[PDB]
Write a protein that binds this DNA or RNA. Structure first.
Lengths: 159, 48, 186, 166
RNA sequence: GUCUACGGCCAUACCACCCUGAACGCGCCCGAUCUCGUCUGAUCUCGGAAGCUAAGCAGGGUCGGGCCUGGUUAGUACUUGGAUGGGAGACCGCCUGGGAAUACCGGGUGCUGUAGGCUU
RNA sequence: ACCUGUCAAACGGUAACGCAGGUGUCCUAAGGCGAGCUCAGGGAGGACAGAAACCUCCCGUGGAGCAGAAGGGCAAAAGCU
RNA sequence: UUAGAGGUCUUGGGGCAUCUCAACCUAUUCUCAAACUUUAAAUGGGUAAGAAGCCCGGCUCGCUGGCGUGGAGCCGGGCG
RNA sequence: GGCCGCCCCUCCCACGGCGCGACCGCUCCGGGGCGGACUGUCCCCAGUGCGCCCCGGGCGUCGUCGCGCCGUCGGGUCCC
């Protein structure tokens, strides 16, 4: 069997990207994480403190605690047929804000304002998303130009 | 300093915009320069 | 075809496991009421008549007084599918109209001495066939000893569940696993 | 170029032995739990990608007005109080679907065919059709239609198959 | 049109060499009494203001290297799903969907935030 | 009983007396903090001096070092004083 | 890890003022990697797709603090 | 009573086609005068783009606006 070491098989997942080694950019320390917001966990090998375990790399959870340098996260982990909400402490360098939540919060805003505009204008507007409908009927003009006739090419044995 | 520390900003003066630096050459200029440098080399080697 | 059958049969009581003929007559009465009346009160009472004794815990007199003193509950009938027991920690009993399957002798004396009325479920049907003006009460269902032993195992970190212990003392399951000085304490 | 069709009829053509877990899940979302069961499916990018998962297990296409008529009239049943009830009177449709404006078998046929608002309710009301075996046989159940088989999207040929199974 | 102090993103910003730099500034520069530190006032620290844009720095240039971006490579390589397809095998073709990477060929060569100057 | 890379099929997990290896220690500093420096290597020079002594300038993205194996990480660093 | 080519400091060698080889450098070229990689799929894994939401008004704090700061908590109201 | 059945007609709308103008955006295969850079034909030379500046041409999916004309088992409880 193989070892139970904590960083076994993290040769590439905790390595820095090509020509992106060196000093950690300072805006990562300036990002502000409040209680209740959703963060992506991505371990950085430049900082060895507060490092998430490899099973949480690529996982997304929400902040439940804020400390001086770290953040507590409630992250779902699948364990042999059951999913449990783990609580892990990760330093700030290994997390970033999740853009999926930001997109949804924007859509709530444009929905509420479109309701207010619709009520004030006495109209009805579509607010639910819809899957890509079947393409509508349309005309295609030839512009007096015949379609080009394609034909399979003969076989040639190259080098 | 203790009696009057407030700073009065120097009043902005409108001035004529005069370029003190060279603007970047365009693609046409760069390509033309190679064309005449090539032609001069051919002409000079033909004369000699 | 392409279905599962392990949950087809719902496990619930459709009749009392009891052979008590008097309970069987009330089940006959409230089976008719649940069918021919749109009242959901008669449906709830019918279910509780089927239920076992552990699912019909005794209702203390003090708790019924607590729940019948809440605002808007005046001149309503307290309905208990179960036993009404006496609480000696209550010293003043107001007037209550209580319907129950069983009432202990001391509880019945205290309720009647206060000016209240005790009804059976056949008199409740005659007075309120729909269940109007009633407060449907229940005893604490998890208020018995077996539930102190249930749940997360005692030898598991954040568990406060009672172990099954033959006798209580310093020498009975207190050393290793319950103490940092003896192995560990989770 | 006509508008690409909005309605599909999907027939399960395979049995329930040795089905992969993902294909099994999609088939019960389409309510095709039995072989030669059929249903109408509204076509959009969400549903089409579902039909691509179960392609070897289904034979689907674009029904015409006669197909939707014969299916609903001859073996069309309703899901009334979780029961499979034959559509013998218009009262059964009106009691379950009349709040949406569907009160007769003609409204339900118009609702399915000219798919629009309330297609979800009208189609879910219909019990999944229990079609017979195709009279005349099949070509090859294990191969796609464009290879001389049975599976996949036979776009307009589905009506030939419906005439033989209904 | 530019600079300075502090920065954000960290080469479209780097590297090599050439040209130009008004005014403020930034420097090079002069000196060692004090503060401070050295084998050495070279560096560091301090006190300056005779000279200079030679250097740093800024802008531009190069059929420049690199970098960024796009074509091509190519519906190629690979790949989800399918068949009582082929082939002795090695492997290959088709149906249903996804779909790259060199060489090669083009275009570009920092944007910007706060505060304070010059272009009078 | 443990650790590194791979196996391992780009989340995690994954076997064989599979492959390549390491461990039962070592350190009052090689723990902690601050300051100041830049390493391997190469080119060109300088009395004895030469392929290798020490001095000086230049180039140097780390190709050195960070005690133990390996992987990751690191430059007015985590390296040296 | 294969082969030619163009230059030269050569603590290099050989045949003989030397001249060819070897060495080094530069620009090319053939072939490769489970324990190599700038690049990089398909199929994967995580999260989200609202009433436990959104938007107004107020109160509490011993935490934080240039501040009417910030953060959290609590009490009302409106919006399907 | 209404509609459809054949003839001058009649209005609006939809789809398609054909032209005519106006407006807008990109472009030069373009012209004319104002400043910067380029060339081993550089003084008499020869080019290269850039700002205002109005004429000329093209494209815009065949842009927007209208105007006409042609087609429809077209639509208007089959318009009047």
């Amino acid at each position: 069997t193989n070892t139970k070491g904590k960083r076994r098989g993290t040769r590439y997942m905790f390595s820095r990207p090509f020509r992106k080694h060196g000093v950690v950019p300072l805006a990562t320390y300036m990002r502000i994480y409040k209680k209740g917001d959703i963060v992506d966990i991505k371990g950085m090998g430049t900082v060895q403190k507060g490092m998430p375990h490899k099973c949480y790399h690529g996982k997304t959870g929400r902040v439940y605690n804020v400390t001086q340098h770290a953040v507590g996260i409630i992250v779902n982990k699948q364990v042999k047929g059951k999913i449990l909400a783990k609580r892990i402490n990760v330093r700030i360098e290994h997390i970033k804000h999740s853009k999926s939540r930001d997109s949804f919060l924007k859509r709530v805003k444009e929905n509420d304002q479109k309701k207010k505009e619709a009520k004030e204008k006495g109209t009805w507007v579509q607010l639910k998303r819809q899957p890509a409908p079947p393409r509508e009927a349309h005309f295609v003009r030839t512009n007096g130009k015949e379609p080009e006739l394609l034909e399979p090419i003969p076989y040639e044995f190259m080098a | 300093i203790r009696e009057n520390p407030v700073y009065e900003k120097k009043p902005k003066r409108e001035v004529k915009k005069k370029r003190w630096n060279r603007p970047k050459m365009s693609l046409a200029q760069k390509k033309d320069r190679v064309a005449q440098k090539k032609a001069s080399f051919l002409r000079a080697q033909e004369r000699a | 075809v392409d279905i599962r059958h392990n949950k087809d049969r719902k496990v619930r009581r459709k009749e009392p496991k009891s052979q008590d003929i008097y309970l069987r007559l009330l089940v006959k009465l409230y089976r008719f009421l649940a069918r021919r009346t749109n009242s959901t009160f008669n449906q709830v009472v019918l279910k509780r008549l089927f239920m076992s004794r552990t699912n019909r815990p005794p209702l203390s007199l003090s708790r019924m007084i607590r729940k019948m003193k809440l605002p808007g509950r005046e001149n309503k009938t307290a309905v208990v599918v179960g036993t009404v027991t006496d609480d000696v920690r209550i010293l003043e009993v107001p007037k209550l109209k209580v319907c129950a399957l069983r009432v202990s002798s001391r509880a019945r004396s205290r309720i009647l001495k206060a000016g209240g009325k005790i009804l059976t479920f056949d008199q409740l049907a005659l007075e309120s066939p729909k269940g109007r003006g009633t407060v449907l009460l229940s005893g604490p269902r998890k208020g018995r000893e077996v539930y102190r032993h249930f749940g997360k195992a005692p030898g598991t970190p954040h568990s406060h569940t009672k172990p099954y212990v033959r006798s209580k003392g310093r020498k009975f399951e207190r050393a290793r696993g319950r103490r940092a000085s003896r192995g560990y304490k989770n | 170029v006509p508008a690409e069709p909005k309605l599909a009829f999907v027939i399960r053509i395979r049995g329930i032995n040795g089905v992969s877990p993902k294909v099994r899940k999609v088939l019960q979302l389409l309510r095709l739990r039995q072989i030669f069961n059929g249903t109408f499916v509204k076509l959009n990018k969400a549903s089409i990608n579902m039909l691509r998962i179960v392609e070897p297990y289904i034979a689907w296409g674009y029904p015409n007005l006669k197909s939707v008529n014969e299916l609903i009239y001859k073996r069309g049943y309703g899901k009334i109080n979780k029961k499979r009830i034959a559509l013998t009177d218009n009262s059964l449709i009106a009691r379950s679907l009349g709040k949406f404006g569907i009160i007769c078998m003609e409204d339900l046929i118009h609702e399915i065919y000219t798919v629009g608002k309330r297609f979800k309710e009208a189609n879910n009301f219909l019990w999944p059709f229990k079609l017979s075996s195709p009279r005349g046989g099949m070509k090859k159940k294990t191969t796609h239609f464009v290879e001389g088989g049975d599976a996949g999207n036979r776009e307009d040929q589905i009506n030939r198959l419906i005439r033989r199974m209904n």
